[PDB]
């Protein structure tokens, strides 16, 4: 069931570490370049994971990081397509961040929307869309990673949607408060992602704590338009942040709006200091 022997993998170079595990560049079957994500034991049920992996395997799209194989025994290994430029969040915060302007950032958003539009077409739900879980490759290619993992995490505080490991600031209120995760809560998160892109990786709701964010957002608060960001793009964010989930745009719409942005919407764009 896409399950492979652990010894068919060679984990060669460390690529990163996060709240729930590490990731390595390596070789599969001594011939194939891959990445291997490795999960801290106790993070999720091997059986529940193996079941979900069968779904993850079916998601085949140029803008989704492809699943190749798994090792379901703890520590769980997830074997995927390898992307050479790291997480989008780190990309935005690092040295290249200074060279990115609105046209690059909008194109990256359009690519992400394209992968998510496939997820949407397939009637699936990501649950944790944000720059930390997007990967960058050569030629500023961006792909969505880690589809289907969020639901499986068993961390104590995390299952209560609280604590340092649960991304409250990136999560739609109905999902954060009530666990109502849908493609429309993914759309909200995409709105937050647009803010990450236009602020070069700044945390959302700067200076606000998690509870304050939830309270304020429920009362109608929305993040403002970033400096040098056209109001039309902030309007798109605000559509993603509509209180009624059904009234948020589709990813199909987001993709097309972003792909056409500089001819249909902002043909008069002039580069600024940052965007």
């Amino acid at each position: 069931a896409w399950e492979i022997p652990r010894e068919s993998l060679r984990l060669e170079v460390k690529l990163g570490q996060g709240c729930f595990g590490e990731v390595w560049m390596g070789t599969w079957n001594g011939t194939t370049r891959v990445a291997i994500k490795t999960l801290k034991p106790g993070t999720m049920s091997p059986e529940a994971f193996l079941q979900e992996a069968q779904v993850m395997k079916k998601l085949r799209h140029e803008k989704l990081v492809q699943l190749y194989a798994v090792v379901s025994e703890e520590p769980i290994y997830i074997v995927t397509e390898y992307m050479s430029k790291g997480s989008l969040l780190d990309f935005l915060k690092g040295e290249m961040g200074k060279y990115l302007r609105l046209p690059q950032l909008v194109d990256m958003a359009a690519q992400i929307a394209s992968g998510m539009a496939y997820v949407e077409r397939m009637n699936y739900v990501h649950r944790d869309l944000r720059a930390a879980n997007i990967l960058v490759g050569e030629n500023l290619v961006c792909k969505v990673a880690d589809f289907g993992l969020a639901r499986l995490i068993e961390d104590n505080e995390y299952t209560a949607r609280q604590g340092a490991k649960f991304p409250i600031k990136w999560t739609a209120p109905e999902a954060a408060l009530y666990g109502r995760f849908t493609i429309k809560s993914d759309v909200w998160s995409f709105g937050i992602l647009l803010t990450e892109l236009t602020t070069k990786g700044r945390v959302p709701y700067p200076g606000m704590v998690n509870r304050e964010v939830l309270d304020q957002v429920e009362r109608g608060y929305r993040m403002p338009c970033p400096p040098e960001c056209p109001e039309s793009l902030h309007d798109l964010m605000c559509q993603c942040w509509r209180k009624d989930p059904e009234e948020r745009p589709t990813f199909e719409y987001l993709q097309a709006f972003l792909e056409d942005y500089f001819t249909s919407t902002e043909p008069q764009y002039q580069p600024g200091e940052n965007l």
């Binding site: 690529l15 780190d90 879980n133």
Partner: peptide, 4 residues
């Protein structure tokens, strides 16, 4: 999750 793997990359912070």
């Amino acid at each position: 999750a793997f990359x912070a």
